[PDB]
Amino acid sequence: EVWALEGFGVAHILQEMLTYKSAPESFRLLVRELRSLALELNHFLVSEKNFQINRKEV
Amino acid sequence: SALERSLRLTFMDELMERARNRDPSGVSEVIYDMIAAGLSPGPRSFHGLVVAHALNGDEQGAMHSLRKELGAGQRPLPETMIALVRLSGSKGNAQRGLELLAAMEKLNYDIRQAWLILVEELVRTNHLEEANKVFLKGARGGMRATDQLYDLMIEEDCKAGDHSNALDISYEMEAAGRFATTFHFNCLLSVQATCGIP
Amino acid sequence: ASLETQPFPLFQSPASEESELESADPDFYKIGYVRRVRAYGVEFKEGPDGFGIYASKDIEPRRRARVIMEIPHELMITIRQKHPWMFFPDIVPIGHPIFDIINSTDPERDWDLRLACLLLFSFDREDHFWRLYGDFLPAADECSSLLLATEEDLAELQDPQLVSTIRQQQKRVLEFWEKNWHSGVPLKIKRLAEDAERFIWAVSIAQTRCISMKTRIGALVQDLNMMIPYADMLNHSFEPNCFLHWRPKDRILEVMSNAGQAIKKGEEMTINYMPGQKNNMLMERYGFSTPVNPWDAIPFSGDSRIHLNSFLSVFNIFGLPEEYYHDSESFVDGAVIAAARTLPTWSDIDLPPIPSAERKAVKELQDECRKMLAEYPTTSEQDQKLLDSLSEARTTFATAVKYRMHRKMFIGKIIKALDIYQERLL
Amino acid sequence: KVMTMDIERLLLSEDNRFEFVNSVAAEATEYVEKNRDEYGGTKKAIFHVLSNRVNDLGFDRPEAY
Ligand SMILES: C[S@@+](CC[C@H](N)C(=O)[O-])C[C@H]1O[C@@H](n2cnc3c(N)ncnc32)[C@H](O)[C@@H]1O
Structure with missing residues (x-):
């Protein structure tokens, strides 16, 4: 169904179905378990305006 | 008829002569003389007074002459507003620029040329940060700058490294239908290359 | 009514000799409406100065530009503006002598001669829409283009440089006709313009009615010179209330009334033929x-x-x-x-x-x-x-x-x- | 019933279906920000955007048809 929804490009429904209908807390779980394996899954986003490397809340 | 016309003629000629000589005290003399002649309304006369102040940079005197002509007169002719906005942008005073440009809304005059002048003079006066403020707030207001002004402002921003505004102006330029050329992307890349994040 | 022949614009209006905007013959709209033309809120009216588009209703202002007409591409004629000549209604069969004649035009000086060739061929191609539409084009005596003038008029023009340019245009057209309608051409060419008058008329129409646009035909972004059988009835204005626009998905030319402009019943819908x-x-x-x-x-x-x-x-x-x-x-x-x-x-x-x-x-x-x-x-x-x-x-x-x-x-x-x-x- | 033909008309109008739908979402969220009437009963902001846009196309449809 994810493959079908993203085939339609209807990606805001896909976002709804995969996040707030139940970073997302399950990605928090993913990063926390890898961080528990002693791997830093580190999420950054780069300001287009300022090139500042904003670390995401993870 | 011809009496009033010749009085108007000679009085406004000696006023304009004082104004070109940047003598606003003289212009005030001729205002008083025309009031004594009963020629009380006259937009050209207060335009002469404002340009007499502006040519010597008397921002306060220019605003005083504006307050005179609005408070005890009639709507100013466009060159009055344009000249006082130019005196702002050439002096700095960008807040006064925006305040008067917003006050131009109430005359129904074309704001485009005055805003272009304000931006251009601010850039020429190296008042780039507030020039960016007035430009972006105009573009978000849906006004289109002249192409020369986009090109100059982008180039000067990128020389200043102000990509935070250069990219935004480039988006507004695209939204205005001026497609970004290799020059504009070269200007953006000149600053982007500095970030160390290729 | 997908047939019939000889519909015409009633000549009651061009009878100003003794001394104003009656409706065009309803068949003039019908031939389009049967072919997916749509006019919205506008009416064709027939003055002694020919046709015009006039608003038949007060149109309220709108936030986007409002459609006032839709013309489908199938009814248009097109020539590529640049050298590699192609026809997107593709009327002309491959290897038809028309392609040889049209190639013998200068790529940029003779676009009017090319459009005139297409116009004439489209009067010869049966059950092309212009077979019916040609009756509503102004005849050689009522077209305004000075290519139909003579020295009797140009003496009244009193503008020697413009007189010289008109004379050069006429010379060019007549030389092209003499070169390419000589007695050796096939009947399927000689019947297009058996006399010079027919060709100079066709060129005058091609000049006076040529729109040009950048357009997209599917994937191909391209420059076209084209004739649109109901946008060419718009009269000129330098303060136009409308503009032409192109939709490539369904290949429609819209005529769009300007955004934020109200217009009044009986107002002439006009466009800016060439700005500046x-x-x-x-x-x-x-x-x-x-x-x-x-x-x-x-x-x-x-x-x-x-x-x-x-x-x-x-x-x-x-x-x-x-x-x-x-x-x-x-x-x-x-x-x-x-x-x-x-x-x-x-x-x-x-x-x-x-x-x-x-x-x-x-x-x-x-x-x-x-x-x-x-x-x-x-x-x-x-x-x-x-x-x-x-x-x-x-x-x-x-x-x-x-x-x-x-x-x-x-x-x-x-x-x-x-x-x-x-x-x-x- | 008929409203999807208007949708198709607007889909035919705009040069990118995804950009059109983005613009509709933008128009609806700015509508529900510039006006704070609840406007959530038998008529919906999406249908309102489609109605206003087809009215710009000149077509006699009422708000949310
Ligand atoms: C695009 S063609 C339209 C054909 C014209 N409606 C007819 O009756 O054949 C433009 C022609 O309309 C007339 N025209 C164009 N602009 C005009 C104007 N501003 N005022 C009056 N007539 C105009 C001229 O005769 C010109 O040849």
Whole structure:
């Protein structure tokens, strides 16, 4: 169904179905378990305006 | 008829002569003389007074002459507003620029040329940060700058490294239908290359 | 009604000889409506000056531009603007002699000859829409384009450079016809234009009705010169209420009423054929002139000059020189905007105009304009008389008279503008 | 019933279906920001955007048809 929804490009429904209908807390779980394996899954986003490397809340 | 016309003629000629000589005290003399002649309304006369102040940079005197002509007169002719906005942008005073440009809304005059002048003079006066403020707030207001002004402002921003505004102006330029050329992307890349994040 | 032949525009309206906008023959719209043309809120009306589009209802303002017409691509004719000639209705069979003739045109000088070849072939191609539409094109005696004029008219044109350019155009067209309709051509070419008059007519129509646009045909972004059978009925204006636009998904030419503009029942729907061309260019190509032409020019050589910014403000003209417009804030019109673009003028950062020396300059330029008027043998209103009553409505001659009259009327408006500018400078 | 033809008309009007739908979402969220009437009963902001846009196309449809 994810493959079908993203085939339609209807990606805001896909976002709804995969996040707030139940970073997302399950990605928090993913990063926390890898961080528990002693791997830093580190999420950054780069300001287009300022090139500042904003670390995401993870 | 011809009496009033010749009085108007000679009085406004000696006023304009004082104004070109940047003598606003003289212009005030001729205002008083025309009031004594009963020629009380006259937009050209207060335009002469404002340009007499502006040519010597008397921002306060220019605003005083504006307050005179609005408070005890009639709507100013466009060159009055344009000249006082130019005196702002050439002096700095960008807040006064925006305040008067917003006050131009109430005359129904074309704001485009005055805003272009304000931006251009601010850039020429190296008042780039507030020039960016007035430009972006105009573009978000849906006004289109002249192409020369986009090109100059982008180039000067990128020389200043102000990509935070250069990219935004480039988006507004695209939204205005001026497609970004290799020059504009070269200007953006000149600053982007500095970030160390290729 | 997907058949029939010979529908025509009732000639009751072109009967002005004894001395105004009746509806066009309903079949004129029907032949389009049966072929997915749609007119929204507009009506074809038939004056002695031919067809026009007029709003049949008050149209409220809208936030986006509002559609007023849809013409489907299948009814159009197109030539590629650039060398590799292709036809997107693709009327012309592969290897038809028409392709050899059309190739023998200059890539950029003879686009009108190419369009004329297509127009004639589309009158020969049965059950092409223009087989029916050609009856509504102006015949050789009622077309305004000066390619149908002769020296009897051009003597009345009194504009030797434009006379020379019209003569060169006619020479070029007739030389092309003589070269490519010689007796050796197939019947399927000789029947297109068996005489010079048919070809010069076709070229005059191609010139007066050629729209050109950048368009997208599927994937291909391309430059086309094209004929659109209901957008070519729009009349010119330099203050147009409409513009043409292209939809590539369904290949529709929209005619769009401008965003934020209200329009009134009986208002003429007009477009800006070519923006920024002097009246002599509109005579050269289209075959008409307009007195409010805001790009017209005057051969001034005076060292007298007027304060441009004060000339603007006294007439409340606004915008940059490419942009000059007038607002509600009443004789000010396109001719005064042309004046601001044309008068010998000076400007300075803030310096005021000399109230005396500007009157001196006004007097000098007014006497220059007066001697320019004096270079014609007659005043404007003599041509107005020669148009409110006229011997035979000879369309090319009446067009030349309209040209001369417009120019004089213009210079008159220049005089009046300088007078009112001086008076209103107080 | 008919409203999807208007949708198709607007889909035919706009040069990118995804950009059109983005513009509709933008128009609806700015509508529900510039006006704070609840406007959530039998008529919906999406249908309102489609109605206003087809009215710009000149077509006689009422708000939310
Ligand atoms: C695009 S063609 C339209 C054909 C025209 N409606 C007819 O009856 O054949 C433009 C023609 O309309 C006329 N025309 C164009 N602009 C005009 C104007 N501003 N005022 C009056 N007539 C105009 C001229 O005769 C010109 O040849």
